[PDB]
């Protein structure tokens, strides 16, 4: 149905996302159990990691477009990522390595995320009708990799240890690299302009030097979240000022604050919702026992099923509003399950968490994808920078929000943790409901401004 390089790009993306989510699904538990972090330290450190992973995505589009070429940058990114996964596996011999290894992953993701999608775009003549379907399948590729990793990585870490989990992440990247190199011939006339000139070693050295500096800066920021906080606070207020001095952009500003709220909520899946499943949900569904950390896999699961349906099935600001109402309902459902539908021993049915994750995934399907197009349709490089800075800040804020559910290591009674989770989830749901309402009220004015 699709050009041949589509299938190469599909499987490279699948395996790269498997490596990434193999780490993401186990990271907070690894912090708590393996490094002895409290739940609060683990949550804010996960927030810092996610902020860097997300904010550095801006680098890879530039490196691929203007310095080395898309295809060269896919190769370099995959190599830096694989190195990061194996360094993470090595951190079990050398615990002092952990932050460097995570910084290496962040920088590696930063170099690689934007480039396969770019490549896929060049596999189709410019107004080909199959583009929409191909990109919907690209998203599904991402979520099949994430579904596999979030399902199996906690199980693998329980049975064989973290070194094996992380080395398998590395192996997934290696086979992504092998599939690319084996298929290089399919994309010989596909690329950005630098792909077709010989490689400039000056620019490659600049890219490697900048990568290493960034690996060290990331390691430091993740080790000292108290300076990540002020760096992003002052940087954010300043870039807010520099946005305000310099009327279709105000739509981007209010939509950026709404995207920030969305990312604060998305950030709860590997942290507070993860530990909620651990502490206050039954670890059995349809008669099968599971690792509760695998419950994170319900997000890609619901995307995999729902992205085709919703492709088959207002316009921009209303889609954002709908996504925000869906997310609000996910957290109000979490709160409700804890308030009224729990056991005498403090445990709730996992069908409630299946529903929480359905609501949250529908929110994802309405907001995240739809917003990039809105960004691409209302607007340049500066707004990309401000966007990435603020959404990284959103992930830091999300780690901080998650700390309100943090449980001390000596607590063992589910009836003590249940009300903490329900208070925080209920208040998140109520605030997000308010945010969704103001979004609705502005939907008409917003929809006028897009004209």
């Amino acid at each position, epitope marked *: 149905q699709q050009p041949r390089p589509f299938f190469m790009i599909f499987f490279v993306e699948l395996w790269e996302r498997f490596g990434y989510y193999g780490v993401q699904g186990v990271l907070a538990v690894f912090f708590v159990k393996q490094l002895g972090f409290s739940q609060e330290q683990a949550f804010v450190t996960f927030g810092a990691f996610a902020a860097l992973v997300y904010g550095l995505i801006s680098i890879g589009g530039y490196v691929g477009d203007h310095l080395l070429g898309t295809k060269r940058t896919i190769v370099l990114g995959a190599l830096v990522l694989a190195i990061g996964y194996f360094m993470t596996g090595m951190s079990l011999l050398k615990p002092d390595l952990i932050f460097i290894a995570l910084g290496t992953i962040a920088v590696g993701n930063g170099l690689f995320k934007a480039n396969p999608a770019s490549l896929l775009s060049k596999c189709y003549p410019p107004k080909d009708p199959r583009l929409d379907g191909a990109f919907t399948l690209f998203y599904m590729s991402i979520n099949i990799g994430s579904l596999i990793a979030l399902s199996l990585a906690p199980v693998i870490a*329980d049975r064989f240890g973290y070194s094996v989990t992380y080395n398998l992440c590395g192996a997934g990247l290696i086979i992504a690299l092998l599939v690319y190199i084996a298929c290089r011939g399919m994309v010989k006339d596909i690329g950005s302009e630098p792909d077709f000139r010989p490689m400039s070693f000056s620019k490659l050295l600049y890219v490697l030097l900048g990568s290493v500096v960034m690996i060290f800066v990331c390691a430091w920021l993740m080790h000292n979240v108290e300076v990540a906080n002020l760096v992003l606070i002052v940087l954010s207020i300043v870039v807010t000022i520099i946005f305000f001095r310099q009327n279709k952009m105000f739509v981007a500003f209010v939509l950026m604050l709404e995207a920030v709220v969305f990312y604060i909520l998305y950030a709860q899946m590997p942290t507070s919702l993860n530990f909620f499943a651990i502490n206050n949900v039954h670890h059995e569904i349809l008669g099968f026992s599971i690792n509760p950390v695998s419950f994170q896999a319900l997000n890609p699961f619901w995307v995999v099923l729902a992205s085709p349906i919703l492709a088959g099935i207002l316009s921009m600001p209303m889609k954002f509003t709908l996504g925000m109402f869906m997310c609000s309902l996910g957290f109000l459902t979490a709160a409700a399950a804890g308030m009224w539908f729990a056991d005498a021993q403090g445990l709730t049915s996992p069908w409630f968490i299946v529903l929480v994750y359905l609501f949250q995934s529908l929110g994802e399907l309405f907001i995240s994808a739809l917003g990039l197009a809105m960004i691409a349709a209302l607007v340049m490089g500066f707004i990309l920078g401000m966007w990435f800075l603020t959404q990284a800040a959103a992930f830091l804020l999300g780690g901080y929000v998650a700390t309100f559910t943090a449980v001390p*290591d000596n607590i063992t009674d589910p009836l003590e943790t249940l009300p903490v989770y329900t208070n925080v989830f209920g208040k998140i749901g109520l605030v997000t409901l308010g945010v969704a309402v103001v979004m609705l009220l502005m939907v008409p004015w917003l929809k006028r401004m897009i004209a």
Partner: nanobody
Amino acid sequence: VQLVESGGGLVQAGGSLRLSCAASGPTLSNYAVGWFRQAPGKEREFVAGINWSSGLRYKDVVKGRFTVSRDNVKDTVYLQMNSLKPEDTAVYYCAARFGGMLPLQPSGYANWGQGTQVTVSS
């Protein structure tokens, strides 16, 4: 995934016993291990447990007599039972649940040992 209990047996009132729970496949380190007991004609009841990060929980009637502990190198959980009384006679089971919680009812635990008989004679 399967726990093996050992160390039960017959003892006189005021004596001591040590139960131990060892797991086969997965490492017990990620698990709260609870000890349950079922006396003749009654339901399994929570006795004592240790979570994955050294938090402890006890039934009222065994505080000051039973101690739960964990040998994290040998991957083993222990129940040290001192000042034993006839009314401690029961089948004892270890059970394992992922994480930091020790729920009071058997339905909170997925993995079960087979049980060791403990008898305390007057």
